[PDB]
Each structure stands twice: as C-alpha cells, then as structure tokens.
Amino acid sequence: HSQSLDRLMNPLIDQYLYYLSRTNTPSGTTTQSRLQFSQAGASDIRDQSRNWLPGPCYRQQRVSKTSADNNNSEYSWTGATKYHLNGRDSLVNPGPAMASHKDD
Amino acid sequence: DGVGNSSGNWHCDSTWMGDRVITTSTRTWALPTYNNHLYKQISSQSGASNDNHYFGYSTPWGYFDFNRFHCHFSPRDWQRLINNNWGFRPKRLNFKLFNIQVKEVTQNDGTTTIANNLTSTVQVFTDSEYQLPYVLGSAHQGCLPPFPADVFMVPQYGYLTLNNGSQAVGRSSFYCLEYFPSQMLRTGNNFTFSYTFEDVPFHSSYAHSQSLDRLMNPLIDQYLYYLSRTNTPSGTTTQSRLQFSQAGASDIRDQSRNWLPGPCYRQQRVSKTSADNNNSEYSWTGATKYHLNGRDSLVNPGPAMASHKDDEEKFFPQSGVLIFGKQGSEKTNVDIEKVMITDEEEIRTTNPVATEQYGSVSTNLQRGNRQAATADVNTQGVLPGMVWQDRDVYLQGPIWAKIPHTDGHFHPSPLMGGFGLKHPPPQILIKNTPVPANPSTTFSAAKFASFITQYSTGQVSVEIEWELQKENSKRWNPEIQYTSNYNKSVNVDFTVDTNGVYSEPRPIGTRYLTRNL
Amino acid sequence: HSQSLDRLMNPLIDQYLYYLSRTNTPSGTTTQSRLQFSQAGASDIRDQSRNWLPGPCYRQQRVSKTSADNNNSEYSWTGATKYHLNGRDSLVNPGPAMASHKDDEEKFFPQSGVLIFGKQGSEKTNVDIEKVMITDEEEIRTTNPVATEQYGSVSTNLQRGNRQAATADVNTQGVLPGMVWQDRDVYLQGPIWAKIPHTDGHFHPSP
Amino acid sequence: DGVGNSSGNWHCDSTWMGDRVITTSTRTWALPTYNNHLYKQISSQSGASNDNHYFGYSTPWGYFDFNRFHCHFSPRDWQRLINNNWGFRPKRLNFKLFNIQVKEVTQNDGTTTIANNLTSTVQVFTDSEYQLPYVLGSAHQGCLPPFPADVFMVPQYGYLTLNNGSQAVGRSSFYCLEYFPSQMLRTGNNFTFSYTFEDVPFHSSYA
Amino acid sequence: DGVGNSSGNWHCDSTWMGDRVITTSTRTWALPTYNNHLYKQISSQSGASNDNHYFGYSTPWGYFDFNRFHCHFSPRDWQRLINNNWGFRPKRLNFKLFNIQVKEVTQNDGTTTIANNLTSTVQVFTDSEYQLPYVLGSAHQGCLPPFPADVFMVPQYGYLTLNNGSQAVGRSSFYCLEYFPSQMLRTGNNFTFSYTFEDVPFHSSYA
C-alpha cells in the first residue's frame, strides 16, 4: 500500500467534526477545567476522525539481529508468545499477520 | 452550445414516490487558480511532532464533493426520512456541470476589473477507475452548502503519500492529473455523468425497544441452572457447597443468554459541566489512540459505542462522538457552547458504553487458599455471538466512505457513520486551463511563469435516488419523532437570520422509530 | 474432532521454517546474547509454525463438583463473569462456546459457562449439585480454549540490554483473523432455535 | 436562441370577436438584486402596537403581478367593455418573458459603468401548485403600468408568517425559493406558460 | 465552430493493449509574432571563424516539434516500455490543434492590456511533401514539455542555406512560406492531420 490507514485524507481541508482538544484553561493562575474543542487539519493530524482502524494483534517479544542488543537470558520459551490448548502450551508461530518492525 | 444560450436549468427538488426518494440539488460554485497552475511538494515542517509528519502534493485541480446529507436533504425532507422509515440507502446518482463562465480579472494599479473570457476552457474529468488517491470521505470542509442560495468555493485537491518524517520514500507515488483524459468546457459546454451505487445495506434508522439482556419472557423460568451459591452456613464453619438455581425475573441479571454485546475500545469520560472534569492536560495523554508505524493517531470517533448510560447525559466520551460546530465557529480552541456534540444513546441496547468496561473475566484458578480474582475488559475484540449497531448518521455528517483496498477488512462500515463503498462515487476534478500572457518575441526554452489571472464560475447539480425501507411495527403507543417546538423565539430553526446567514441549530440523527430485537 | 488444532502436521517431517530457539550462548563463562534458530519437528512440537489459532475466549471462574475444593466465600456474583449494559451487570450465561475443562480434570465445570439442567422433581431455588445435571463441552477442546484458563500470553514491553521480556496472560480475547472454533453442543432437553436480534451488526449468529 | 437574435415580439393589442375579448399587453421590466442575494428574517420593531406586529421573511426573488384591470384594458377598451356587456369573466391567460438582458454594473470611484454580461442567467419559476404563500391579491404596488410605454421595477417577494408579537411560533414556516425547480435564462432564452381559469361567475357589470 | 464552443478536448493518456501502445499528449502553447511579420536574411557576423560561418533566413512562422520521447512517454510509461520489450518502433501519429485564442495586446503608456480578437486568424500548414528545409531532428529546444501542465512557446522557424563565408551562393534557395496553401483558423476552427510511419526497424532496446 502506498497509503497508510491513518494518512487517508486531504491535508489541505479541515474536517467539520470536533474533537476534545483541551481539558483545562489558565483562568488566571488557578487553571480550572474547561473542555475545549477543535477541528483537525494537517497540523493536528494525529487526532482526526477516521472511519477505519488497524487489524488485530497478538504481541510478540522483540529480538535483535545484532546480538549485543538482545537480552542475556533464556527467553526463547519463557518470553515466547504462545497459546494454551488442552493444557499444553504451543508456540504461536508465525501467528496473525503483523508488521515485523516499524520505520528505520 | 453558444455564448448566449443556457446549457442547463435549476433542478433543486425532492420527490417521494413510494419506496424511493430522489433528492436533487443545485449550487453555484467559484473555481480559482490553485498554486498558480503548479504542482507543489508539500510536507510537514522540520520542527514538528512525529505524529504530525506528513508528505504529499498539492495540485492546481479543484474537486466537487457532496458527501454531506444536507447537500441533498432539506431539514423538512430529512424529517420525512427519519420519522417514516426503518432504513435507507443510495441507489444511483446523476451529476451535472453547466452554465460555466470563465471570468478574466485584471489588477491595474487602482481597481480590480473583471471581464468575460469567452474562448477560455475549464478541464473536468472524473476518476471513475479509482487510480488517484481518494481524499473524499475524510470529513473535509468545502462541500455543497446546506442552503441552496449559497455560493461555495471549490476546494483544492491534494493527497498525502508515504513519509519517513518530512521526507519521501522510494514507494511514494506522484500523480499528475493532466495525465488523465479530461473534457474541456467553454461557455456553452456542459459536463454530465451517471453513477450506480453498489448493493450496500440499508442504514439502520431505528432504535431498539429492547435491550440485549432483556430479551426473554419474565413470567417463565429457564430450565437451565447457574451456580448461584458457593458456600453454605453448615453450623458456624461456613463450608463450601456449590448450589444451583434456575433464573427467573427475580434473578434476572444471571440468566443464560444466546448473544453478547458488540466490541469496545474504552474512551476517557469528559463532562459537559466544566466543574466535573479533571484539571489537567489529558486531551492527548488521556486520549484513546492507536499506534501505526511508530506514530500515535487519535481514535476518532472509533467503533460505535454508546456515549453514556441512563440518567447520565452530561457525559460525552472524549473523542468517541462526532462534534459539529455551530455557525460562525472559528477553527481552534472554541468553548463547548460553540460546538454541537452528538449522541449515541439509541445504541445502549446492543453496544457498550464507550466510557465503561466491557465486562470482567477471571485471571486465576481459585483453590482452597487462592480466591477468584477478576480483571475488567477495557479492550474487547470480536467474539462469536456478538451483535451490534453501527454509528448513527446525521444531516450534516458524511454519507459514504471508500473502503480501503486491502486483503482483509471486517465489517466495512465507516467509523464516522455512513455507507462503506468499495466503489464510491468518483472524484470530480476541475481546473482552469492556463492562458499565458504575451511571450517574448524571441524564443525561450523556459516554461511559462506568466499567466492571465482568471477564475471560473458555474452551476453544479447532483441528483441522488435513495431506496427507502418502510416500517411495519405493530406498536400500540405513539413513538418518539423529531419535531420542531411550537414555543416562540427570535429565529425559526433551520432558517436564515436577519443578516441572511443560514444556520443549523442541532445535529439531527436518523434513529427515531423503534424495532424489536 | 479427532485432531486438535496444534497437532495438525506430519510428525515425521521437519518444517523448512525457523523459529528463535535460543537467546543466549555460554561463550566461556560470560553467557553473551546470541540469537539462535532451529527447525521444528516432533521433538520441539510446541513451537512450530501454524496457520490457525483457537477461537475466542472470555474467562470464567472455575468451580469444583467436589465441594471441598471450592473456595469458602460468596463468589457466585462477585467472582462471576458478567457484561455491563446500560449501567446494569448481567451474568454471562453460558456465553461463548469454550471447553469446560481440560484433560484428566473432569470435576471442574466453569461457573456459568455450561448449561445446567435440573433432574426430575427439582425445586427452583438453592438446590444441591445432586439435584442438577451439569453438561459438558469436552469435545471442543480441539479448537476452543478451556473456559477457566487464559487464552495465551502476549508481550507487554520492549526488551533491551537492561529491560527484560515480560508477558501478560490474555483472559479476554476477541476475534482475530485465523481463528477457527466450534459452536456449543445441543442437547435433547436444550433449545432448538433462537431468534437473531434485528440489529445493524451481528458476528456469527449462533445462539 | 442566440445573443444577437430576438426571442420575442411586442404584442400589445385587444381583439373583440363576439362573446370573447382577448387583451394582450407587453411591458419592459427591470429586476435588481434584492437583499444582496440573502434571505432575511423581517419582523415588526419592538416598540409597536399589538395590531401592527408581524413576522416574516424577505427573499431575493422578484415577482410579476398583473392583477389590475389597466394592465390589460386601455380606457377605450374598458369603455367598450362596460357600455355593451352585462357581465365578463376571464377564461385563460398566456404569459411570456423574453429579450432578457443581464447588465453588469461596476462602480469605479467616479462613474457608474454598465456592460452586458452575456453568460449570466436569470432564474424563473411559477408556483403552479400553490405551495408558497400567496401575496398577490392584496392590492400591492408594483404591477404592470397602465400605459404600455412605461418601464416598471419588479417588486421584491416577501411573506408573513405566524407571530407572537414580533417573535416566531413553532408553526412558522420558512420557504426557500431555490428549493423549487426554476428555469435558468440567458440572453436568447425565453419563458412561457399558460393557465386556464376555473369556472368563475360573470362579474355583474350592470346596475 | 463558434466563439463559445470548444473545438477539442484534453487527451493525455497511454493505453497498452498487447503488441501496441498508443501514447497521447496534450499541451498548451503560445505563438508570438516573429520578426514583426518579416522575412530576414540572417548570416554569421563578419568577424567569425571559418567553421562558424552560416547563411540563412528567419521566417515569421513558428513550428511544432514533438521529437523527444518525454513528449509522449511519462517516466512510468517509459519504465513499462524498457523492462518488458526487446524493441519498439512508431507506426502512425495523429495531430490536432484546437481551442485557438488570438489575443490582441495594447501597450498604452502605463499598462499592458490584453483583449480577445475574435475575427483574427492563424495560418497552419504541414509540409507533407518535404519541399521546405527540414530543421527538425537537429536536437533543438522548444519541443513539447516533459510535463503535461507546462505551457510552451512555439519556436521560430529558420533554415540555413549555402554560404561562401557570410555571403550567399547563386544556388542558395529562398523559401517563402506564404507560398504554400495554409489553413486559416479563427476561434472555433481546428486543425488535424494524420501520418503513417514507414517500415522502420525496431529499436534494439536490449543489451
């Protein structure tokens, strides 16, 4: 995909929907709670209204290819992601389709 | 197709003829020159959050959008829709552009002069094969106005692409829009296309008169047992004896049931009364958010959950509700009086409340010395046996959204409400053809940077046919319906004021009739 | 099912895929971290690559038929698995179709994850376990989780050279792609049908 | 239907052919922009009598009215009508709009300049199903002139609604007139409709 | 063929349908007056190298050239061409000129004013019998731009002839281009011709 799920809109146009942008306001020096609302554009891009949300997960432990970043312990079964079926534990391998890492 | 000959008429009507309603609109538009005829790489600034980095392109092209229900329905036509129908969906649309006038505008040192330019064209195409990025269905400004006498400005088309911060990726696609076949229109020429909506379900425009837990006969017991007691007072030692009971109307909370409520994803709870809210900055730290490629995006509005429970109407969630602005509301940091917070209280029957847990599950295995401990479920996926309602649609909310072309999707209803369409109504892109100024009398291989300043105007018609779903209730008592109040006021609702400014006072949802589960 | 979901392969042939089998190696006496990979056969059978994973769960408290193993407290509502709808709590009964117990452990029904039928001439309130007929979902141990145990475990942090890998067990698990499961058994004195509620959305409308 | 082509001729005549008379008129009109294209809530001022309180709306729309007898009869044609007939009534009418010229007017700091705008339209519809408030028949100014050489100004359309003083009632109806189908007319285009009067009695034109 | 009527549409596309690809481009051009409508003898200056002496003529005529591969192929269409084909060659072309606007420009002492001139023509011919000197195929600037949104300027036509230094030879041919039949085009008129490429070999697009 040449587009990510969160970046699926026109950056140039705002939305007509509001989101709760602030919770408190500095009324002098007491900082009372006043709910404030904003429309989201390209500047506040992380908090727009969206129609969809990402697929399911089932968290895995993270292992490095560089051997110095890995933890010096036996975690290949104790730190393993596993399911429990009729009283025995089976390694989830490879499991549901998730991304192996993020950017950079 | 001449200069002094009209190329189309004003069609702005709504006809109800049974199981169908056709809604026709007509608006006047104005299209300026965007980017001074240039394509420009746009991105976020270098000093910005990682969540807010973007990369994309702005085009000289404008686009027509009519993805709001007030673009096609008047408030009286919306009231006919919602008090008489258990459901509705779109069937087909018809689009027209006509009476196009390209005005040339000359700034000569004191006074703007505007003249006609009869031999100038306007390029129009539709992206009917879905090979441009689809920016519609993202709740943007610049649609057709709610009121037919208003003239609107055509918004500039732009798309985002892949980014690594504010930079580009090798998989980032650039799209030239003059690489499509477009129809060139002078005055006298017109544009028209038709579109057939795919088989979409009816939008459920009813509430439920029964909740999911109250779906049985109160008068008859069940033949099934449940574990009702764990210990018995055998003298004074209170030994453990498992005891079982049949559940009736007295023990109504613990009956055997076939179904269970739809999925949740908990939101923080915010009060409309400002004194009940917490005095801290929690609008991003206390926010419900998802994590995608290392950046956090606000879940807004998310999966369709109830905004509050009974007798507790002053609590919307935080970002689990469409928040519409009132007329004349500025874009940043407005108080709650300037906005119209919607409500999902009709789906309390099948959906969980957005600010509460799903339920509780056990976390250990109890023994003679270990006790039973339960943890509450704040995020609940999809189980077999779940039934739920989608988000309500509003008169100023979106109509459709494009389903993203992916390998997998579960229940492709748009989370902002509306009709999920694999093939939505196509993008209608529009652009003034560049008319250059006088070139130099010697040849220059450089491209033209000097153009005659001009804009276009004209009329636009959208005619959507909607399929209705009539109600067949055998309900005795009268139903809740959307009504106007008869109490006098300085201004009639959904009406211009003394300055000619049209305003919509409240969001009108579509769920007023009832239906049994 | 005569096969369980984890035992769905040829024991005689290895897989061509690797899995992370070891994390550290004894390089002398310092025990440095070196990631090591193996192919899984019948000897390391718990950690093969699999195409599917078990159906959804929603954990129940575990109750014994033998009255001496149960906890001496009132947990029939406080330790109960329940959902919360319009501000009131309703008992999840029997809920999604899960196995009532695992192997060699038949004296444990869950708590309210099982249809409990009454014997003939049983009064309606507060009867002992001899007056009722507790059913059993032991045939769906092949694809469904046990109702009284966790689904599995997922990581909760990102381990580093000084942070270790910690896992939290999954007690409530929704629906993932790749799930397969069986529905609840029907009984001679159980219901035949139910009406699906007229709503906008429903997933897998089995009662 | 072109720029330099007339879309209608001057018909201003009266023909007496027995038990019928057909009266044809033609006038030149001028339509300005009303309310600067706005709908405006109008009402009485707060300091006013209770008899004089009103509530309504002004529209950008103009309206044509010909509800005066001098619009159709000359004084010599009226004299033929009244000295020879015991009664008269209308039977049918025919309406036309034609030779429409949209003039653009520019105020540049010293002098009004007026130019043609050839590609500009004018929206015309008839409310033939009587679902707008009917403001004709209230003896208002702005009809066709008695004399055919006079140029008249098209009056602004406005209606009153229910009021409680100068305020509004919940039953007050607002009418958008761009919510009707209208015919858009450039230069070259024309408008026409016909109408048949219902069976009305003869007006008793005798003593 | 009128003033307010388009004489052609924007075709800028590429269709791949087997052993053929059709590449269509559309550009906007601007043609000024060249030499102030004059034919001029041009030559090298008298102080110049012998290698650099030339003799020829400049014309008032502009010329259209599309003898660059980016005039017809986008970079994505060029990438489809080169990673999938051992060879390619042209078969036929189709040329169009349309939507022609002759703007009159008046310098009055402070400000350039530009107006339409509706009754003014533009002379277009093709030299399809190869009896003018062929200046294309010499890698000159002024072709169609690589990018479809760019507006280009039509280059001035000129040819060289025989010289003896900066002077002329008796065999030097002068060519008047108003001695050809040309098509005169106002606004509303358009120009079109077709051409069939001769049997040329495939360009070897392999290593």
PDB file of N, CA and C in Angstrom, chain C residues 28 64 78 86 126 136 152 163:
ATOM      1  N   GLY C  28      32.181 -19.202  27.018  1.00  0.00           N
ATOM      2  CA  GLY C  28      33.064 -19.297  28.162  1.00  0.00           C
ATOM      3  C   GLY C  28      32.288 -19.352  29.461  1.00  0.00           C
ATOM      4  N   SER C  64     -15.518 -26.400  41.451  1.00  0.00           N
ATOM      5  CA  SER C  64     -15.383 -27.843  41.567  1.00  0.00           C
ATOM      6  C   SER C  64     -16.717 -28.513  41.878  1.00  0.00           C
ATOM      7  N   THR C  78     -19.871 -12.031  42.847  1.00  0.00           N
ATOM      8  CA  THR C  78     -18.652 -11.233  42.844  1.00  0.00           C
ATOM      9  C   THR C  78     -17.542 -11.864  42.016  1.00  0.00           C
ATOM     10  N   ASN C  86     -25.944  -0.696  29.806  1.00  0.00           N
ATOM     11  CA  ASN C  86     -26.773   0.434  30.254  1.00  0.00           C
ATOM     12  C   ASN C  86     -26.691   0.603  31.774  1.00  0.00           C
ATOM     13  N   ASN C 126     -31.959 -22.890  45.070  1.00  0.00           N
ATOM     14  CA  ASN C 126     -30.931 -23.290  46.036  1.00  0.00           C
ATOM     15  C   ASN C 126     -30.869 -24.800  46.243  1.00  0.00           C
ATOM     16  N   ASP C 136     -21.437 -30.660  29.626  1.00  0.00           N
ATOM     17  CA  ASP C 136     -20.000 -30.714  29.422  1.00  0.00           C
ATOM     18  C   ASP C 136     -19.698 -30.382  27.969  1.00  0.00           C
ATOM     19  N   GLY C 152      -3.685 -17.080  25.994  1.00  0.00           N
ATOM     20  CA  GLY C 152      -2.270 -17.284  25.816  1.00  0.00           C
ATOM     21  C   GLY C 152      -1.527 -16.212  26.570  1.00  0.00           C
ATOM     22  N   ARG C 163      16.338  -4.090  30.142  1.00  0.00           N
ATOM     23  CA  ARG C 163      14.931  -4.408  30.349  1.00  0.00           C
ATOM     24  C   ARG C 163      14.673  -5.807  29.809  1.00  0.00           C
TER      25      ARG C 163
END
